Amino acid sequence: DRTIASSRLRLLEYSAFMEVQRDPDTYSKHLFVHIGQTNPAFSDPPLEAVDVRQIYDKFPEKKGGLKELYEKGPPNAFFLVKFWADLNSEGPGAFYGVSSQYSSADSMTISVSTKVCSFGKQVVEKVETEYARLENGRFVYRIHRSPMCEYMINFIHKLKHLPEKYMMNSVLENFTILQVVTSRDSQETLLVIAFVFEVSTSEHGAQHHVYKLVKD
Template identity: 80%
Template structure:
């Protein structure tokens, strides 16, 4: 007999209780969902007669050892299924986020959308294993023997002891001087100079204030640097025919800026018998008549303009335009004299900062702009005299 909580149980009653307990467990197993709760194993050390008394007050019913083991297997299987679904959802969320961050061009690109598994693994150039990359862990240097037998070894460059000039491209739309000199599609500046001539001992002496000499560019020469034309609008007249209006009309490839370092080291005194002259030479592709307008501006205002006309001369299969020894205007002569009387060069540069010249070469018949050159100035400090630098004017 068993005594529990003051109640005496005979063997028959105890056997009957065991039968009822097993029946109750089977019914409970049929009604519950496996995997939602972990059922604790409580009946391994409790006498069988006590099971029936514990059932009404416990949320979880006792199970036999064989049943408990089976439930644990089912619970683990259910847990794996839930984790697999969660991983699939996380992968979908990551993929959706990746696509949302791609641009339209990247989404359409075949390199993004095509699977990459068909390509062989790339040759690595860093030591040590790389995650997700098969192959050897040794350091593969550039041009070393690759680990793939299908890739040929690199061919060593031929031995050369002389620097070979770069070959000319097979098809070039523009001639060599375009983008490297002051030139447009129809006209090129060959030479420009402003100078003074004096006679000493029956000999003429020439002093160059500014000078752009002839050049023979090659394709290996660098192209001209660019400057935003809007940065210099305020240094030139904004009236009709000014730099801004001309640039908006175009063509844009005809506009240039020249920075001159002028040589004012001449010792000729004011009032002496000296000649102040300007010469320029152009080469074109058409037999036309050109009009050359030279505008002098001070503090962005036009103060004087000189207009000249020149006809084409056929020379060596090209049309050449020459303006030779054209007299400098009185305004420029007086300006040079006053500038030279300043005691210091920094004072001269302060004056020249607000002094500019705009030269426009156009087709006299059609008024088409062939070349437009903006000149700005400083005083040269070099022992080599006048110098210059050319920029292309752009509107970026």
């Protein structure tokens, strides 16, 4: 279906942004990485596969770690997403947030873990609980303007400081984010997304690419 979905849950949209208030009337918002709600086109080809074994070490090993999650399954829930971040956006106290939306055929309470990882070691984990709302023959879950942690704020600023993009990509090669969305009381896994990043060498802006994770 070329979507980031598992039978239990679907990630409709994902956004990481900075917002600034130019004047009291006007606010400017720049998106670092963006995934939008797109309709599946009949024409579209299947998602390519990446052997999960090959990305194990980019994420912590023991627990909350790909190998273990993937053994727990369900293996249809596991995806990989490659962002090309737009790093061309400033002042003190602009707001840094992450805004996402999910859809389901059921109503649950979902818990969203987000581990920022460096060199496969996790530097921080957020945990968010989100509740179901009903629309369109589906239940949706909205996460509005969730704050960015400061690690990531410092990382983005200092990463933008670097003189050349190829350096940025050198730093990014051991930067990952692992996101696991569970049902809160079940702790059943609904959706796991591994995230890897590259700086957009084009001025084309934010791009992404989705691959299914497999264990042949």
